[PDB]
Structure formats: C-alpha cells, structure tokens
Subunit: 256 residues, 5 copies
C-alpha cells in the first residue's frame, strides 16, 4: 500500500500549503488548536506525574505513558495542524514534488509558531485555575521544566529524533487505516512508548515551559533555557520526521 | 479536514435543537433531564470511588476517578440527549453561521441548563433514598468536595470551567467528526479522563454534587448559597469554553469566506 | 436525535416478544432461564473476586468488582435472550405506544421474571456442586453479602433498584441506538461498572446470590424468607426505574403527537 | 433475536466439520492439533503469571490469570481451527436439527479431542525444551496445580467442567451471532476471564497442564494416572455443558416448529 | 472456515515480496530497516519498564513488560513493512503452494533478516546518543539481559525461538484472516504479551537489545561472544517456528487437494 500512501501524504502536504495561502487566520487557528490539544495531554500527565511522584511510586513514568494518548488523538480526530506531524507529511510531499521546499518551510515555521500560541494560551488559562499555585503538581511542572533545559544539547537532540519517529509513524498509520479506532489505538501505543522511554516533544514542551513561566511558583528555569530546549528538541523532531520518516516513506512508495 | 463539513453538521444540530424546543417544550426538557441525570450517574460512581480510595489514602484516587467518569458523556452521546455544556459549542457555532438567533441560542442554553438541573435534582433525591450517603467514607467525600468547590475564588472556578467545556465540547466535536461509535466513546473516555483528573469544573455535574449534598442530612458542610455561587462561576467559565473557544474556533476553520 | 426510529424499535421488540410467548411458552422460558443464568455467571465471577479481595483487605474490592461484571448483560445482549429488568422499559414503551397491552406486559414480566429465576436456581445448584462454596472466603462473601441484602430496610432497597434498572435499561437502550456490537459491550460494561460499584440493586443477579447461598449447606445466614424480602423490594425498584423512567421517558422522546 | 439463523449457522458448521474429517483426516487433525496448542499457549502464559504472582503473595493472582487467558480461545476463533469444547455445542445442535448424525458427532468429538491432545503434547514438549520449567516458581506452579486437579473429587471436577464449557461454548455461540471480529474477541476475553477466575475446569487446557508437568524432568507427584483421571471427569463435564446446555438450548430457540 | 482463501493470501503475498525485491533492492531494504527499528522501539520501551520495576523489585515486572510490547508488531503490520520472523511462515507456505521458490525464500529470508539488522543498529546508536543508557537501572537492565540471553545454553535459545515465532507468525496469520484493523492490533497484543511474558526468544528484537549493549559507554558483560551466538540460536529457532509449523501447517490446512496433481493426504 506504499504508493497510495505516498499519494496521500503528497496530497496532504499540498492541502496544507493551499490552506496557508488562502487563510493565515484559518491556518494559525488550526495550529493554535493543535498546540492546545497537545498541551492538554501535558496538563493531564504532569498532574499525574505530580500525584505519583509525591507518592513514591515506581509506576509514575509508566502511567504518564498510558495517559498521554489524548494528545495526538485530539489532533488526529480534529484534523488540526501539528508541527512534528508536518515534518514528515511535507518532507515527503516535497520529495514527491507536490510541494516546494520553501512551501515546506512556510508550513514548518507557521505550524510551529501556531502551536506555540496554543501552548501560551493554554498555560495562561491553566495558571488562572490555581492548580499550580503550589503543591506537587506544580513542583513536577517546575522540576521537569528545569531538568529539560539543564540537559546537554546532544542528549536532547537525539531524544527529539526518536520522539517524532514515533509521533510521525503514528500519523503515518492514520493514513494507512480507515478504522478511527485503529488510529486512536496506534496513537496511544506510540505516545505510551515515547513518553515512557523518555523522548522529547518540542510542542509538548511549549506547554511545560509556558505553564512554568506563568506560575508565580518560582522555579529555576529562565527563558534562555526553554528557548534552548525548544531549539534543541525541534531540529531533532525535524530530523526524525523529515529525514527518517519523511524520506523512508517517499522511498517505499514511489514508482521509480 | 472536513472543517466546513463539520461546521454544517454543527449548524444543522443547532437548527433541529431550536426546532425541537419550539416544536415541543416537554420533549426538550425530558431530553435535557435525561442528560442531566446521565452526567450525575458518573458523579455517583466517581464519588463512590472517591470515598473508597480516599479513606484508604490511595495515591491513585483521582486518577481512577478520572478514568471512571467516561459513562457521563458516553451515555449523553449515545442516547442523543440534550446537555448544556455541548450546547455552548453547537449553538454558538450555529449562531455565527446564521442558522440560529442569538436568543435561539439563549433559550436553548437556559433550557438545557435548567432541564439538566432537574435531572440532577431527582437523581440527588433518589440517591439519598438509597442510604448510600447515610454516613461513612462516601458521604464524607460528597461533603468535603461540595464544600471545597463552593469556597473557591471565583477566578479559579471560572478558569476551571473554561478548560472543562473545552474538553467536553471537543469530545463532542469528535463525535461529529467520526462515524465509529467506539471511536466516540474512546475519545469521550479520554476527554473526561483529562478533565476530571486535571481538576477542571463542570456545572451540570456540580448540580448532582450539591443535589446530593443538600438533600442529605448527614451532609452539612455546604449551603444553598455556595452551590449557586459555584454554578454561576463554573457555568460562566463553561460557556466561555464552549462558545468562545470551540464554538468560534470551529466556525473559523469551517467558514467559506 | 432519532428518538422516533428508537421508539419504533422498542415497540417492535415489545411486539416480537409476546408473539414469541403466545407461540411457545417453552421457547420463551428457555430464553429467560438462559439470561437468568448468564447474569448469574457474573455474580459467580464477581463474588469470587469479592471473596478473594475482601479476605485481603483491598480498598479496590468494589471497584474491580464493578469492572468485572460486564459479562452479565454482555452475554444477554449478544445472545438476544429474555431478561426481566430489560423488559421493564421495553414493555413500558411498546404499550404506552399502543403496540402491546397492559395485558401482554404483566405477562412478559412474570414469565421473563420466573424464567430468569429458573436460570438462577440451576446455576446455583451446579456452582455449589463444584464445591467452590464449601469452605472459605468465596462462600463467606456469598454468606455475608446475602444477609446484608436481607437485613436492609425496604425503602433503601427500593431506591437502589430504581437506579440499577435505569442503568441496566439504558445499556439496553444503547444496544438499540447503535449498530456497533463492540460499542454495545463498552456501553454495557460502563453501565454495569457504575451500578455494581455504586451499590445499586439488581433483581435477577440476586436470584443467583440466594440460589447459591441456599443450595449450599455450608451457608447458614439466609433462609428463603429474607431472600424474598430482598427480591420483592428490588423487583419493584427495578420496575419503577425501567418502567416509570426509561419506559415513560423514551416513549415521550420518540412519540410523534 | 436471530435464533433460527443462529441454529442454521451451527447446523451448517457441524456439516462442514464432518465433511472435512471425511474428506481428509490429516487436515482435521492438523487443525485440531493447532487448537490444543493455541489453548496451551494461554496456559503457559497464565501459569507463568500463576508462578510469578504466587511466589509473590499477591491477592490478584487468580484475577490476572483470568484477565490474561483471552489469547487461548481468541487464537482458536481467529484461526478457524477445531476445538473439542466448541464441537460439543455445534455437533449436538447440528444433530438435533437433523443435519448430522450421532456417529458424525462422536467421531468429531473423538477426533478433535485427540487432535487437541497432540497439540498439547508438542507444546508441552517444546516448552520443556525452554528450561523455563526446569526450576523456579513457574515450574512449581505447573506442579502444585497439576496435582490439585488430579486429586479433586470427581463430582467437583465434573460440575466445574459443565460451568466451564457453558462459558467456552456461549463464547463460540457469540462469534456466530456477530460479524465484528473485535466484538468476538471481547466476548471471548469476558467468558475466559469468568471461567478461569471462578475456578472452572477445561479439558484441553488441562492437557497442556499435564503435557508440561509430565515431560518436565523437574518432577513432582503426578502420574499419567492422575492426569487421565482429571481429563475423563472434566471431559464429561465439558460435554454436558457444551451439548446438553448449549447445543440443546440453542436448538430449542432456533427450531422452526 | 477459509484456509485456502487464506493460503492464497500468503501465496499472492510471498510473490509480491520477491517481486518488489527483484524490482528494488533498496525499496525493499529500507522497508526492512524500518521493521527492525519499529521492533526495537518495542524493546527500548519495555526495557525502560524492566529497569524501573526491576530496580523497585516489583512482581508485576514481567507482566507489564509483556503487556507493553504490542507496539512492536503493531507498527510492522500497520506500516506494512518487512520483518524477518514473519517472513518465515509466508515464504515457507509460499514454496509449498508453488508460487515462489526455495532460493527466493532464503533470499528474502536473507534480505529480510538484514534490513531488520540495520534498523536495530541505527536505532541503537541514536538511543545511546540520548544518554538514556549512561547510568541507571535501564542501562543495567539492558546489560544483564544482554548477558543471560547469550550467557544462556543453546538448547534454551532454540526452543525459546520456535515458540516466539509461532506466536509472532500466528499474529501475522490473524492479520491475514481479518479485515478489522483493530482486531489485528488486539490479536497482536495478545500474542506479544504471551510471548514476552512467557519468555520466548525473538531474533530481530535481540538485534536491538545487543546494539544498545555494545554501543553503550558503561558497557557490556557481553562480547559479540554472546550476540552472534544468541542471534544464531534464536533465528534457526524463529525459522522453524514460523517455517516448520506455521508455514507448513497453513499449507496443509489450505491445500485443496485437487493438487492432488502431485500428492495425497487422507
Ligand atoms: C503572530 C505570529 C505570526 C507568525 C508568522 C510567521 C510566518 C513565517 O513566514 C515564513 O518565515 C520564514 C522565516 O522564518 C520564511 O523563510 C518564509 O518565507 C515565510 O513564509
Ligand atoms: C477496546 C477498543 C476496541 C476497538 C475495536 C474497534 C473495532 C472497529 O472495527 C472496524 O470498525 C470500522 C468502523 O470504524 C469498520 O469500517 C471496520 O469494518 C471494522 O473492522
């Protein structure tokens, strides 16, 4: 089914750019939504992170895994626009010559900034709830924000590669099935696997950092680091969805 | 992406709704009353689970609660009954697309919300009549939880309503975007898991929290004053979630212009 | 929204039943006793779980129990056999809709009910002969639970029976409003989780509880008379719940007036 | 209800089974061989969990074993292979509705049972070629379990075998009454969960418990004798559930008279 | 029923493998590099869970691992890429029904096994580049386990390998026997749960166990003295399991003896 699958991606990447050109507003709103949806997955699993860490549980990371599925299922079911997702779609619509290389940069920049707006809004709204005034949920937000930015560039970059491989292969699957339940199941597996192994997702991290920098619970982060993390993780995401995933699928599916 | 397809579904749903309310009150109110009591049933369950695990000081309590809430919207979706929270996105998207009046939207909203409250009252009543809240760790969960919800700063509540109806309305958005009933239940299952466990606030459900709390004699931690104070703030937040985010957001994605 | 196409089905099934009964008392009763026995299986499984987990002092006891009862209405639905409680609403409507009579409806409720009971008795006899209720925490869980059911005030039982059959019948309502069998089961499993774990009462599962409790000679807490007290209060609650509520409501939603 | 259609379905499945033994003994035995081994896989996994959770004092042992047994009957349905248990309902229903003869049924039963036994033997052998039962609590679990089943009183095993094949068969009955492969797998998971955990007896499953426990050089307290004793009692038990309840029951429900 | 209607599918499908391999030695190898990596993704995940619960000393350890391995074959099937252990059945059953040939089998078998190999390796370096195996119970879990699997008698690894593949292949068999994708994944999860938790030996997944072990800083307790050895036993095993049993067995069930234009069963 590889050729049809290429034609599905190719065709998908043409609709992205087609969309951006007609309405920046629709395009950025679609992306804001996706950034939010992913964030909501963070709200949930950090809440859980906070709960079980306080407890002493060896199960904390496993359950955060299980619980993350809502992040990409929401994106997939809503047909909203996600950065990492597009790393592969465009990276292979481009090799198929459905879209220009610079069609592919406009999409990446807009979807990523669009996602970031979804994050900041979510974070702002999440802080108004007081759910991170203080407490273990708010210390989890704060401690995770810190470790992620205080980790070397190479470590982050490679975790970024394995994250999008997985996020992207999850999107890939949505093109290769017509069951919506298989889509959701596969998203849940790939998200379980990436969160639990310890891989880094740029757009998720926008909500981690967006929340941490809006909560007057004094952390130890600083923008330099968040931006540092987001640069490090984002390229890897690109490498993981564009290179591996994006290129491999063009390869498998192209009538040469 | 079917954004416009989607918006047209939302637009027909707002229409049929106001036709239904206009065409025949008592049906609209029975539809709503069922919704209101289906939601409440997920309170009965998750608070039984609340009282059970909290007595044990289990760290899983809220997680398991979040997990056990799916029934509330699953039932509403699969019976095709009228919930207030979902009406915030449907009517709002529908008003912008000129399918419905603003006061169509107004009526629908006030009705479901009141209809729901009626199903929550009955439920609260009948549930007290079971003696399951006569005393012990479960009564205590209803009393501590109705108290803390009603003593919370308006701002915190308001914002908690927004994040909730974003979750509820999008789980309902999903149901418009798929023809798999299992997919609907799964998505709903995920949304309610996120919003219960994350700590977001849902007016129609709080109805049953205060219904149970005000009808029960062994529950005297809250008053008929907080309940209203909670429903007002939480509901308002809910409306913002549904109309201002989902409702206007879906209208933006789908509108030919 | 399709509450008319749904009141058609409820009427159509309320009809296809009494036609079955008028045409074969034996075919009807074989189906009844099957569902009584299908329901009883979940009682066996969950009381096993009951006995294992109580004996250990898990706070999870009632929860794992709820989670594990889905088989009861699952077998019923998937084998399209006759179950009392599911009929409180299916006869409720059909008649109110003028498709079957007050006559064809007391008929269904004694047959389905007694047939069901036959299934319970036969499961009891066999399960006892497994020796699985000879000595220990499973036979203890049957003893302990059977008494508490029989020493509880009529009123509490009544109300716990209303809620049980709103959930039970709404799971049946769901099986009618969808074509996905997987979704039917998810929905059954949700409603079964919420009624068992909440503490609501089910007439037909209880037939098995007392069936097992009595036929077992290592169990001496019960007597018939107390099992009768329980069954009459619970059967009446079920009826109200499925009949006044789901019966009356769904006719009201689907009736073109 | 589509009982008539369900009973024609079984009748034609019973026809296809015998026409297939007759056509080719080897293909039938191979199919039966596969089912005994697909069932064995289950036992290997749930006995691994058996050993693990047991050596660890956990009250969830038997609950997890039941939850974990689904693969056994799932692989059988999904592979379309020939399982003794199932043939009890199908052959009988099929002979009752005058589609196959008593000799057809006895030959199917005898053949599929020996076919099943062969699969059990190979698996057991190959499993001992793992060293996973050389020593440690997984071996010890095949050891004490194999012995308690061989030493149980005949009546108890007999009745345990009835309840077991009612569950196995009603779960084959469901795969006949749905077109959804996911819903077949859920109903199988539910039924196996119920039969494993409540303590019911399954012949073909025991073949592997004895296939493993014998060939395993790490020893115990077993004897072919005891294994044979278990098998006989449990087979009779299974046959009664399968043919006398399920075969006969479904026959009475779908027969056009 | 429907075993011949099945057998045509493994048949019509053994072909298509050889075909596209004949047509694109690179289109085919990337398609195998992937599979091996999808499988390795299963290992990083469940191995992270081993470290976690093995360092906590939990009894649930091997159970939860088995319940978590599903992602491995689920991605192969859903992506429709090339995996060695699966090929065994399909290629085997392929000859028997006379659609594809012995040398093809062992070639696809040879180019399946090798596509899978890379993926473990690439994935191997990358995961170690995460520094997620520099220090700790996961780094550890990965080493020990890499030890035993090769510090284990040949006879264990062989039979632990045929069983793996009965299970791995029977899941592939089910994905041939349903048009339900959700049904596919579920049966893949049942089989992978059973096979991981019982403790059966999977070739491709060990390609990645061993990559991460060599490739690591904090080492070893290994030497390729293990690998090759371990892999060589399990594979052989894997083949038999899929080839001997599943391949020939499905042929037998499938073969309409109006051929018969050759041999007679009963
Ligand atoms: C309020 C937020 C609006 C952000 C809009 C950003 C749109 C990005 O626009 C892109 O910028 C790239 C450089 O970054 C260029 O290479 C592309 O040509 C251009 O399309
Ligand atoms: C516990 C979760 C199990 C989910 C099982 C989902 C089974 C769906 O199964 C699939 O549904 C599709 C509709 O979406 C149909 O088009 C397919 O024919 C069917 O195979």
């Amino acid at each position: 089914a590889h050729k049809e699958t290429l034609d599905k991606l190719t065709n998908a990447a043409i609709n992205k750019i087609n969309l951006l050109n007609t309405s920046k507003v629709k395009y950025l709103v679609s992306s804001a939504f996706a950034g939010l949806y992913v964030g909501i997955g963070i709200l949930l699993i950090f809440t859980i992170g906070g709960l079980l860490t306080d407890a002493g549980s060896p199960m904390t990371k496993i359950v955060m895994g299980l619980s993350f599925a809502i992040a990409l299922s929401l994106v997939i079911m809503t047909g909203t626009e996600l950065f990492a997702g597009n790393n592969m779609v465009m990276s292979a619509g481009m090799l198929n010559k459905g879209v220009s290389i610079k069609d592919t940069s406009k999409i990446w920049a807009y979807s990523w900034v669009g996602n970031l707006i979804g994050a900041l809004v979510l974070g702002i709204i999440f802080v108004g709830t007081g759910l991170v005034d203080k407490g273990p949920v708010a210390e989890f937000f704060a401690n995770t924000a810190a470790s992620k930015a205080s980790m070397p560039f190479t470590a982050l970059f490679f975790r970024g590669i394995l994250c999008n491989i997985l996020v992207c292969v999850s999107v890939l699957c949505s093109f290769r099935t017509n069951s919506d339940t298989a889509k959701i199941i596969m998203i849940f597996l790939c998200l379980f696997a990436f969160i639990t192994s310890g891989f880094e997702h740029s757009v998720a991290n926008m909500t981690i950092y967006s929340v941490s920098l809006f909560s007057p619970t004094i952390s130890t982060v600083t923008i330099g680091g968040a931006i540092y993390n987001l640069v490090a993780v984002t390229l890897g995401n690109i490498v993981g969805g564009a290179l591996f995933m994006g290129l491999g699928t063009y390869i498998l599916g192209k009538e040469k």
